[PDB]
Design a protein around this ligand. Structure first.
Ligand SMILES: *[C@@H]1O[C@H](CO)[C@@H](O[C@@H]2O[C@H](CO)[C@@H](O)[C@H](O)[C@H]2NC(C)=O)[C@H](O)[C@H]1NC(C)=O
Ligand SMILES: *[C@@H]1O[C@H](CO)[C@@H](O[C@@H]2O[C@H](CO)[C@@H](O)[C@H](O)[C@H]2NC(C)=O)[C@H](O)[C@H]1NC(C)=O
Ligand SMILES: *[C@@H]1O[C@H](CO)[C@@H](O)[C@H](O)[C@H]1NC(C)=O
Ligand SMILES: *[C@@H]1O[C@H](CO)[C@@H](O)[C@H](O)[C@H]1NC(C)=O
Ligand SMILES: *[C@@H]1O[C@H](CO)[C@@H](O)[C@H](O)[C@H]1NC(C)=O
Ligand SMILES: *[C@@H]1O[C@H](CO)[C@@H](O)[C@H](O)[C@H]1NC(C)=O
Ligand SMILES: *[C@@H]1O[C@H](CO)[C@@H](O)[C@H](O)[C@H]1NC(C)=O
Lengths: 281, 33, 50, 38, 99, 113, 67, 99
């Protein structure tokens, strides 16, 4: 079953600041009272993160390129957002990954779904029409003013799809809160398939349909080094982006969060070759 | 400690301390981590 | 400027950091030596005109 | 080939100025300037 | 030859720099001393070995140069400490020490 | 190779094609089509140093590009290199953070003097 | 998976990670996802037992000079 | 910063030891930095090559560390000789040497 939604109001997507969000645990190693430098796919500090709204008539469900990794932020109340769709062509030609959380249980499927152009869920007060070749199923625990901040990081490295998650109690009305929250790794998924494009799933409210108040943010990961701080209890409390500004570069180089007064050698500047010239007789 | 008005308490060993160190020496050992 | 050479060089660890640190120590040591030898007075004295 | 020469912190004129100050102190004041006020 | 000590230090530093730059021209048992020639002439399985030979030779040269630089730095530091002692005792006072 | 090509004042003999310096690196080359000599200066490379006070006092920083002129990158040209982010003052104070070539830096914004 | 012994220098094999060390009880409260533990020098000094959800410290086996 | 001179010595020694232990984690061009992984994953004809690479890298690291320790030991010995001279001439007697 598919339904076209024709009551949207045209508006450009917004943009805002990432602040110090998007941090996750790079590995499964406990560390105590130490500073560790990692070169992973991370989200830059104070980056331009795309902002989408669900308000009533705005119903933002575009399909975005996956790139090398995805940071999803959700300022959510009443659990409108239920899951995600990953794939390359989003049809039966290729194989797609489906993540859903309905009212009872969390379902992860890898099938060749014939997806709707506008897939959604519905609550009264339709995602795919077919699934032919299903290669993997996984049933897990429930993952789920705006009251809840849900932060997720999706990576697809070496055929392993890593889902990192964090839940934060928040009381900010509109934008992202400013603070630090490390994302614990939640699901390590053995899919081994190509993913280049994704789309999130929302839930309608029927009384036509009404969209509940929700807001989400999409950011993209780039390969970079972070300096992570581990406290006495092994919880990540602070991080430094080594490529953001020279002060954080100095912090990354000296492996300390406090830099004493002085001059410190931090990098090497080389003028890159702008063109290539060949001269022959 | 009759030294003609000269005071050496900050450099002489302290009997009260178990390490038998001077206050200056104790400060030096405290300030090195 | 070879990327492949740098990638192979990374396998050997922090040798480059050690060498740079040693050279930096020598470079600051020379300035410290010059300060110790010549900067022993904090007043710039001048001779009388006559 | 990646070699750089860092300039000295004290330039030649400043080192000459330091020597001039030492010469002026030792000529006009003897050894008094080295142990206290000139 | 009045100013031989300074000229010796300058010559030693310049000679060390010249030797360190000159060591790049040595192949250290590889087919060539030029990285571009190896990268453009051979496949990566054997080019990795040739680059590895160049890296170990150049790293050995650089470590050797740093080692003599540190030894010379120690000698210059000792000479500077002696010079500071002469400045303190001979210029800023009258010294009773013979010679 | 990689370098910057500049007009040369050398007097290459006809057989001679590329010129080498004391260290046997190619410092001059002749163009094979138009017989003119060009110096090959190595491309600008330098150290990047961050001048900062304590993080307890301030988070402001300045950057020094060692041995790099200011036109190939609060801009101040020093003999040590190009200094970005520190204002130059004409007053003279004692050295707080050493920059080089008689230039020192301090915090009062970060000033260089 | 053989029985686990403590306070002795044994050859440990935890989930394919092998070594030789004394396995003692640990006071480190690990997070549920974390399995290994490292010190400042990037050496594994703590581990979580797969059979029983407990944390063990690996002290290295006794060594020293003989004079 | 009153006691900076002792702190620099302590920091340099700790940093050298830390770097020496960190050098064990480098494979030096081998497949892995762990000997046990090489012994369990490969046959002895290739294992000898891999341990040869690890041995030469670790031996070079240890030789570098020992050389740095020897140079620092020489500097500390010079400082200690100076300290003994100050103990003899400033504490056990009155010195006419300026500064
Ligand atoms: C909702 O709208 C989309 C977009 O128009 C429909 O998708 C089209 O479906 C037809 C099926 O015959 C295809 O031929 C078109 O190529 C599709 N368009 C795109 C852009 O993919 C979708 O079918 C509509 N939903 C329903 C239930 O009709
Ligand atoms: C020598 O100096 C010490 C410390 O400077 C003096 O001890 C102080 O004595 C006064 C009163 O007698 C106390 O209020 C202080 O608390 C003491 N200070 C300490 C650190 O103990 C001492 O009195 C001086 N004179 C002699 C003769 O020892
Ligand atoms: C974010 O990007 C949009 C366009 O994509 C741009 O208009 C906006 O200024 C950017 N924000 C920042 C902080 O750079
Ligand atoms: C993944 O899909 C994209 C487009 O769908 C394609 O360009 C890319 O080559 C694919 N990669 C692999 C490894 O199949
Ligand atoms: C949620 O989905 C699962 C699998 O799709 C299904 O078995 C379950 O009944 C669903 N829950 C409800 C309330 O329909
Ligand atoms: C995938 O599904 C189609 C149609 O159901 C079928 O023809 C094809 O053989 C399936 N492929 C595999 C690998 O099962
Ligand atoms: C670490 O945990 C203890 C309780 O086990 C707690 O008292 C302490 O505040 C925690 N430290 C931090 C930095 O949260």
């Amino acid at each position: 079953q598919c339904v076209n939604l024709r009551t949207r109001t045209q508006l450009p997507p917004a943009y805002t600041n990432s602040f110090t969000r998007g941090v996750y645990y790079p590995d499964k190693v406990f560390r105590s009272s130490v500073l560790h430098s990692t070169q992973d796919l991370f989200l830059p500090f104070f980056s331009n993160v795309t902002w989408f709204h669900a308000i009533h008539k705005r119903f933002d469900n575009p399909v975005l390129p996956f790139n090398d990794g995805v940071y999803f932020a959700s300022t959510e109340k009443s659990n409108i957002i239920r899951g995600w769709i990953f794939g390359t062509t989003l049809d039966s030609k290729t194989q797609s990954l489906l993540i859903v959380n309905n009212a009872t249980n969390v379902v992860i499927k890898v099938c060749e779904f014939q997806f709707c152009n506008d897939p959604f869920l519905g609550v009264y007060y339709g995602v795919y029409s077919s699934a032919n070749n299903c290669t993997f199923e996984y049933v897990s625990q429930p993952f789920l003013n705006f009251k809840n901040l849900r932060e997720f990081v999706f990576k697809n490295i070496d055929g392993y799809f890593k889902i990192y998650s964090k839940h934060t109690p928040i009381n900010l009305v509109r934008d992202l809160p400013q603070g630090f929250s490390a994302l614990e790794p939640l699901v390590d998924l053995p899919i081994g398939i190509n993913i280049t494009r994704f789309q999130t799933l929302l839930a309608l409210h029927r009384s036509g349909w009404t969209a509940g108040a929700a807001a989400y943010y999409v950011g993209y990961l780039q390969p970079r080094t972070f300096l992570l701080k581990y406290n006495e209890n092994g919880t990540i409390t602070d991080a430094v982006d080594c490529a953001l500004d020279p002060l954080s570069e100095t912090k990354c180089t000296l492996k300390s969060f406090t830099v004493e007064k002085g001059i410190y050698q931090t990098s090497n500047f080389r003028v890159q070759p702008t063109e290539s010239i060949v001269r022959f007789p | 400690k009759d030294f003609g008005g000269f005071n050496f308490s900050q450099i002489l060993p302290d009997p009260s301390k178990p390490s038998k160190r001077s206050p200056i020496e104790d400060l030096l050992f405290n300030k090195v981590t | 400027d070879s990327t492949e050479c740098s990638n192979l060089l990374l396998q050997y660890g922090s040798f480059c950091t050690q060498l740079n640190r040693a050279l930096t120590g020598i470079a600051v040591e020379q300035d410290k030596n010059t300060q110790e030898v010549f900067a022993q007075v904090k007043q710039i004295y001048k001779t009388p005109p006559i | 080939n990646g070699l750089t020469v860092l300039p000295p912190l004290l330039t030649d004129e400043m080192i000459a100025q330091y020597t001039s100050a030492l010469l002026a102190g030792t000529i006009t004041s003897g050894w008094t300037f080295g142990a206290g006020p000139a | 030859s009045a100013l031989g000590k300074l000229q010796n230090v300058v010559n030693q530093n310049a000679q060390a720099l010249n030797t360190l730059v000159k060591q790049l021209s040595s192949n250290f048992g590889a087919i060539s001393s030029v990285l571009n020639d190896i990268l453009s002439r051979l496949d990566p399985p054997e080019a990795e070995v040739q680059i590895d030979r160049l890296i170990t030779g150049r790293l050995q040269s650089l470590q050797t140069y740093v080692t003599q630089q540190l030894i010379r730095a120690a000698e210059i530091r000792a000479s500077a400490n002696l010079a500071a002692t002469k400045m303190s005792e001979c210029v800023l006072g009258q010294s009773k020490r013979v010679d | 190779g990689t370098g910057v090509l500049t007009e040369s004042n050398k007097k290459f003999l006809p057989f001679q094609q590329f010129g080498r310096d004391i260290a046997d690196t190619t410092d001059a080359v002749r163009d094979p089509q138009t017989l003119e000599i060009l110096d090959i200066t190595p491309c600008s490379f330098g150290g990047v140093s961050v001048i900062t006070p304590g993080t307890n006092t301030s988070n402001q920083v300045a950057v020094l590009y060692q041995g790099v002129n200011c036109t190939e990158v609060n801009v101040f040209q020093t003999r040590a290199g190009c200094l970005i982010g520190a204002e130059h003052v004409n007053n003279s104070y004692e050295c707080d953070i050493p920059i080089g070539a008689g230039i020192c830096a301090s915090y009062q914004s970060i000033i260089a003097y | 998976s053989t029985n686990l012994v403590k306070n002795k220098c044994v050859n440990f094999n935890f989930n394919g990670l092998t070594g030789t060390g004394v396995l003692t009880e640990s006071n480190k409260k690990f997070l549920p996802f974390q399995q290994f533990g490292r010190d400042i020098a990037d050496t594994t000094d703590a581990v979580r037992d797969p059979q029983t959800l407990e944390i063990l410290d690996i002290t290295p086996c006794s060594f020293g000079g003989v004079s």
